[PDB]
Design a protein around this nucleic acid. Structure first.
Lengths: 120, 117, 119
DNA sequence: GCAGAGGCTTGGGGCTCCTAGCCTCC
DNA sequence: CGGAGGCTAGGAGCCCCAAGCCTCTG
């Protein structure tokens, strides 16, 4: 098994790939195992989220969410890795949240997930 | 409910408030469940020794790290794991005596990665 | 003005002259100014003091006391350099306490104030 | 028997990064 | 737009020293 490295390509365009940025976005998405995803579904409630949801992805499980306060992409990644028990994890800020959600409800992607429907 | 460690072992602990010192060995005091969890979720510091212990209505996990950490950095670390579980963490100065006192009559030993020292 | 440094020689045998010693004594003696002493007479009460007495030297007064808990001669020396931020004072541990007080009552000196008689 | 010397042991704190927000430019 | 990147209050790691403790010895 690859793991792999980054988000699947079919939605890898909807993401922000900035290593040299300090911008504090409000929208984030993550990619781990459905198990590690299930647990992170609760930890996120430290940044007081307005919305959150976990979807079903091929050979993984993506969970996106949005907070009220702005935060760093790096700040979120560093926060989740605290639970990383030899498990894989990748974090990137979503520039277009509405496009992402609907894309995770297509064919290769399902739901289970969320909390609220429309966004801000 | 219990804030600050019991008195019988408050002499082996460090009660610094305005210190920026970095020590390697600590001791945390939380519920029995958070104790078990923070036993493995602490291996992210590449510890040398960790030992499960128990107390009156709570459990204490003392441990040591090859790297030097601040006592306030350890309380901020466990804080991210717990949410309901009470968190009172103080570094230990007399780790040998501490270890022993937690194996005496009123206490006991549960699990230990490596013997002692 | 003939500014003085260090206790007068006529009593420099009742004092501790240790400079490289980490020892912790009990009885201390300060040699500052008249009102500088009267000041420290209270500012020292922050040390849970048992006995304390103010005497009169020559160029000023001499504060004498005993702390319930031991301390460094340097610990007090530094603590006295906190309030005055001026003037001149000498802080040294008192090796011969009973003998000390005696001379400070002898004619060359005189007692000015003591919260309790020493025993 | 002192009295001075270091042997130790802690907390305080002056620094020097790291972190993770803030921001505005192109 | 969305990166890049400056700016800074706390977080957290360096180090030392102040001020206690102690036993030793000349």
């Amino acid at each position: 098994t690859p793991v792999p490295t980054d988000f699947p390509i079919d939605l890898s365009d909807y993401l922000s790939h900035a290593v040299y940025s300090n911008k504090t976005v409000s929208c984030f998405a993550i990619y781990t195992t459905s198990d590690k995803a299930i647990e992170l579904y609760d930890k996120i409630e430290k940044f007081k989220v307005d919305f959150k949801s976990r979807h079903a992805c091929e050979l993984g499980c993506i969970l996106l969410f949005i907070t009220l306060s702005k935060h760093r992409v790096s700040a979120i990644k560093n926060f989740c890795s605290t639970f990383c028990t030899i498990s894989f994890l990748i974090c990137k800020g979503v520039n277009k949240m509405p496009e992402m959600y609907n894309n995770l409800c297509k064919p290769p992607y399902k739901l289970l997930q969320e909390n609220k429907p429309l966004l801000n």
